[PDB]
């Protein structure tokens, strides 16, 4: 542990005082956005939040509760949302307008992700058991994958828009090459409950979270299990997962944020937010020790790993 980590705690550097299901930084880690049950996407300036004692710079009202946000990796001002009606919307945060409203899903969509390398491409997953790939220049889905169970999370590989990880209520991660969707490249078994999040640390390193109270690390080059992380409590809710090159962070039903170094199976540190509440969203500020977090009361905290 000593060899890999130099941190022992998380410091609170800001707090903005109603579940927040998603908290995400824009392309430049300059703005961040929150969304959830209140049917409003709120955008904040990170530096203002850190420096000052708090008001969003943009708010966009929605027709449905929001489950996930994903900022565009090329168009700074564009952000996608998924909602409880199944609608996947692309918004412009400067004009406040919906640019695209994709309505093919028949049930709640739990997740949306904009590709980093082909930034007009976005993927969504839904309780309707479908994965849909969309292009911002086309109204109809480009790819549709019919699966056997509810899809809880979708994520593009950070190095290529040809690969997506799909976390399913069937307990497995289905890893697809979108150039041939007749069969996944590989299906990763190991979780004992639904897979609620999938996030990549790098081109070849995939992390997942599950309501079996574990995170897991997987090698998508050689299709291997790597490591299981334990300590947090997650038996029921979407509690958030975020990863960077070295660290994984997740929420807990004990109203605590947990941090793991990818080489160590038990936590580096944890933070009690302050059972009755659960952490509901987390997001690293790229490869830095700074993180955004939010809980089921709608409180937002900026945390920083510290010695």
């Amino acid at each position: 542990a000593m060899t890999f980590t130099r941190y022992s705690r998380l410091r609170v550097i800001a707090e903005i005082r109603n579940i927040v299901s998603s908290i995400e930084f824009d392309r430049d880690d300059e703005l961040f956005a929150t969304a959830g049950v209140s049917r409003c996407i709120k955008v904040f300036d990170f530096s203002s939040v850190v420096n000052e004692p708090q008001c969003p710079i943009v708010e966009m009202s929605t027709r449905s509760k929001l489950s996930c946000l994903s900022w565009n990796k090329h168009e700074k001002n564009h952000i996608a949302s998924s909602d409880y009606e199944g609608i996947v919307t692309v918004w412009d945060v400067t004009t406040r307008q919906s640019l695209m409203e994709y309505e093919e899903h028949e049930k709640r969509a739990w997740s949306v992700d904009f590709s980093r390398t082909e930034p007009s491409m976005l993927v969504s997953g839904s309780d309707d058991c479908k994965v849909k790939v969309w292009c911002t220049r086309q109204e109809a889905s480009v790819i549709n994958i019919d699966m056997k169970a509810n899809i809880c999370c979708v994520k593009y590989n950070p190095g290529s828009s040809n690969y997506i990880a799909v976390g399913s209520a069937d307990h497995h991660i289905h890893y697809y090459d979108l150039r041939n969707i007749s069969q996944p490249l590989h299906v990763f078994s190991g979780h004992k409950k639904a897979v609620s999040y999938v996030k990549f640390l790098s081109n070849n390193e995939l992390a997942s979270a599950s309501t079996d109270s574990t995170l897991r690390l997987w090698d998508v080059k050689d299709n291997l299990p790597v490591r299981t992380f334990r300590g947090h409590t997650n038996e029921k809710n979407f509690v958030g997962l975020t990863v960077n090159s070295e660290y994984l962070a997740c929420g807990s039903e004990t109203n605590e944020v947990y941090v793991y170094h990818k080489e160590i199976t038990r936590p580096v540190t944890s933070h009690r937010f302050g059972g009755s509440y659960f952490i509901s969203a987390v997001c690293w500020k790229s490869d830095s020790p700074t993180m955004l977090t939010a809980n089921s009361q709608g409180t937002i905290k900026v945390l920083v790993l510290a010695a």
């Binding site: 809880c152 409950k193 309501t211 029921k236 979407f238």
Partner: peptide, 7 residues
């Protein structure tokens, strides 16, 4: 609620 589907 934000309960993860299972079964």
């Amino acid at each position: 609620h934000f309960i993860v589907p299972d079964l």
